[PDB]
Amino acid sequence: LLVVQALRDNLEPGTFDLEGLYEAIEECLINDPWVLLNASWFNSFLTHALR
Amino acid sequence: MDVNPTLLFLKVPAQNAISTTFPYTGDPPYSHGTGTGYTMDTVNRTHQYSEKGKWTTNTETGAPQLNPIDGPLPEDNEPSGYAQTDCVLEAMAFLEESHPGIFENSCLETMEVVQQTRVDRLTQGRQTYDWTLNRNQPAATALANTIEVFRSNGLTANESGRLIDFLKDVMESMDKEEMEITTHFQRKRQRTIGKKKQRVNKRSYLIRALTLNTMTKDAERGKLKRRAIATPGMQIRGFVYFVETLARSICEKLEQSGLPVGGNEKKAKLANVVRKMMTNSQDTELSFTITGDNTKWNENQNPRMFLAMITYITKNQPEWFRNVLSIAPIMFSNKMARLGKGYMFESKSMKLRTQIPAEMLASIDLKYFNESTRKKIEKIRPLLIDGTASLSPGMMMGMFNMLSTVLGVSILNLGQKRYTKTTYWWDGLQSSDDFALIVNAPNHEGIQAGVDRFYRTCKLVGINMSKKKSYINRTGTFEFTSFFYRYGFVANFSMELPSFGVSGINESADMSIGVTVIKNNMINNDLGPATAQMALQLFIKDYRYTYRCHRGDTQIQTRRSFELKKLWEQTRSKAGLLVSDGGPNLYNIRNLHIPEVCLKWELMDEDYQGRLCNPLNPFVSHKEIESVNNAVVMPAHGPAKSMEYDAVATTHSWIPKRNRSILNTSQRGILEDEQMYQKCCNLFEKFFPSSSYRRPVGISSMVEAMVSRARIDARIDFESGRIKKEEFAEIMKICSTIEELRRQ
Amino acid sequence: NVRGSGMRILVRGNSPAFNYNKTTKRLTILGKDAGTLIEDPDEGTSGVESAVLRGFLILGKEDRRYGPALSINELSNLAKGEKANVLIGQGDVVLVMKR
Amino acid sequence: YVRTNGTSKIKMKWGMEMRRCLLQSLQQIESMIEAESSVKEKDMTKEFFEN
RNA sequence: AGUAGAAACAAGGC
RNA sequence: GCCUGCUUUUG
DSSP, X not given: OXXXXXXXXXXXXXXXXXXXXXXXXXXXXXXXXXXXXXXXXXHHHHHHSOO | OOOOGGGGGGTSOSSTTXXXXXXXXXXXXXXXXXXXXXXXHHHHHHHHTTTTSEEEEOTTTOOEEEEOTTOOOOOSSSOOOOOOHHHHHHHHHHHHHHSTTHHHHHHHHHHHHHHHOXXXXXXXXXXXXXXXXXXXXXXXXXXXXXXXXXXXXXXOGGGGOBHHHHHHHHHHGGGOSEEXXXXXXXXXXXXXXXXEEEEEEHHHHHHHHHOOEEEEOOSOSSOSSOOEEEXXXXXXXXXXXXXXXXXXXXXXTOTTBOSSOOTHHHHHHHHHHHHHHHHHSOSSSEEEEEEEOBSSHHHHOOHHHXXXXXXXXXXXXXXXXXXXXXXXXXXXXXXXXXXXXOEEEEETTTTEEEEEOGGGTTSSOTTSSOHHHHHHHHHHGGGBSSSEEEOOSOOOSSSSHHHHHHHHHHHHTTOSSSSXXXXXXXXXXXXXXXXXXXXXXXXXXXXXXXXXXXXXHHHTTTOOBOSTTOEXXXXXXXXXXXXXXXXXXXXXXXXXXXXXSOOSSOHHHHHHHHHHHHHHHHHSSOOOHHHHHHHHHHHHHHHHHHHXXXXXXXXXXOTTTTHHHHHHHHOSOSTTSOGGGTOOOOOOGGGTTSOTTTTTSSSSOHHHHHHHSOTTOSSOOOOOGGGSSOEEEOOSSSOOEEXXXXXXXXXXXXXXXXXXXXXXXXXXXXXXXXHHHHHHHHHHHHHOGGGGTSOOOOSSOHHHHHHHHHHHHHHHHHXXXXXXXXXXXXXXXXXXXXXXXXXX | OBTTBOOOOOSSSOOSSEEEOTTTOEEEETTEEEEEOOOOTTOOOSSXXXXXXXXXXXXXXXXXXXXXXXXXXXXXXXOTTOOEEEEETTTEEEEEEEO | OOOOOOOOHHHHHHHTTTTXXXXXXXXHHHHHHHHHHTTTTXXXXXXXXXX
């Protein structure tokens, strides 16, 4: 969320290992409805942001 | 329409709404059983990231110790504990070069502290692992048992009352063949409670003095998986006290540190530093900020580098100072680790369960365990000595954070543009396992080169950066220890959310703390006035339901809904009663800074006023000035801090009861010792009233001073005052019998 | 001057002291909001910036034809109609033209 | 609807004090209001909630 | 069964 | 029948 905000603020953001961050997020999505719903919401946010 | 709160971040920035991203209204994760597995994981990890070093066997413990210092250089971006001495010392040298006189002055201050301080300073702190019992006990209990065994053996220098003499004693105790200790038991059929002597050979005493206890950390916010932590003993405590004193003194003089400052001091320093950087930076220069965490920070950092640092900072000082600061990194380079509770086993067919202690993992068949645990034990079995694993190549969580910050600032000081010898440069802010770097250069190529050089200069010392959790943007926005800076620091308010309920101390204290956190959050955070009124209302509901103190004009049946109604009907002025006695709430924003007794003192009835505020009440207990109006509270993302609350001593200022489980254990005889000591000390405060305000001083037995003062007060009070002749003769007779009992 | 320290406000572009977000249109001084800013229809969206240099315009981005990047304090050498490159701002090269 | 379920002391303790949630939400709301009241030097609760 | 989730509870100790 | 309901929690 914060690196996306840095992109919207036009601050030239960068990373060193992004797939590690994704693999760390996806490590926690197992079986809880509420968390999976938050993740779905985050994907919708990335779709409507990042434009 | 399907609802999505995250879309709110499409209009409001993420820092001005970051409070939404903190789920601190729910229960936090807890551990349930043993922590042996996480201990094994940490041991095998820090032996993995330092594996190309050389092995040795200590002559004193017999333990296999891995030395990675001045080992090979890394070839990939994986973690490494291969530190180089020459580069550490070059870092320290250039640090002193840029900030001269820092080590001299810090050493002088610490020399004064070393010479003056006392053993009682070890009584105040956190729990402590007691080798006498092979578990954790409070600090003063551990100190007392250690002193008892020392005096039982022959080491008696601590009678001087200084700390350094106690350290001389613990050093002299290692050169003894057979130490002796005493252990508690109890037997019931009749509850017999006694003691028994046992012996400890020299190597056993060494492994017990060098070992640390381990346990799993509950109530962690922000992690899917649980972590292990360590607790050090009594013998490694004074040395590390002096070492952290030195490190504090140094880090105070550095504009980059963040560890010795808390609260708004921290944010102020951070902001001043950022402004200073952006002023020294040029206008044609491009500027970037890395928000960074370090990975495996406490496993790579080696005590031998700390010994190098110490010997460079004590350069040209007296050898006693150099030798009393050199002992902590030694003892943390030959350290061990208790594995823990063990494991538990299950049989479904026979319907039974069992426990397995950690002191048989070397002598147990591995059929029972699953694959991960089998591998763990298979790797660790070489390092086992008497139920504790050798662990040389790294620290543990929560120790030497100050000196580690000193090393971090040493690396940050290598970006001064007279040490890079180029046109890029860098600076930043450091706390233990977190940092903010700021890099300046005229192009993006210089930015990449500075980032690369920072990474490599930090890998030459054993400082690894987490690429998975770090990111670089332009200057203006960053994150540091859950402080979100966006052209200025920003309020969050969800870190402070579990502090808005009943604290669980007593009625008066919980009331005062409850109103005080509201006005604090009004000052420091951005809690508005209406929301604060609502917070009052909700706090008072929780207060009333917890403590069973409803308005008195209500029909809510509780166990004390009858006494409160009788009090209600006796009372004429009902706005003068306390919420704990069934009265209204007269609080608002105007008057959040006033206690509950002074707020309503002209509204009270005189009989109620005199009953409530009475010194003869049996409910109040004040013991020492450092514990009068001061309570331990447990925030989110921090250690248990101490909060000062303004209150008046009333009959509501009660203490609650104790755990009472220890009655069923072998160590039941600690209660009797506690009880007897408390009898004696209470009587001493009867004779000497100042003993609870000012520390006494003396060498005589307590009874001697007591009977002496009795005689003196008797004489002075008979001469001109109250005491007649009969009392005088009788109490002098009692003094005489006390002498006949003590001297024979 | 703020507490004896010279806070520098950059002519060209944003700063930590003065930043206008182009997304939510808020202006921000020193970390404090200072009003939403409105969209004038006559806003020249032509890439030209006539109010950064004294006697020079800014035609756009750099081009490698007119030579290396001159600096701010060495521009009096130029003359009428002499385009050139200049490095200014946070390490950004641009093309400029005298009047 | 019939079920077997279970709970712990700490889960009960934290569900015994859910009213704190009311603060969280409301705090953020007031922040937004205040962020405009500083800009337009007047209270803005009425405008937001009515208009 | 169920809670839960890298190890435990589903009472424990003498 | 007796006893217990946090006896080991980094900074």
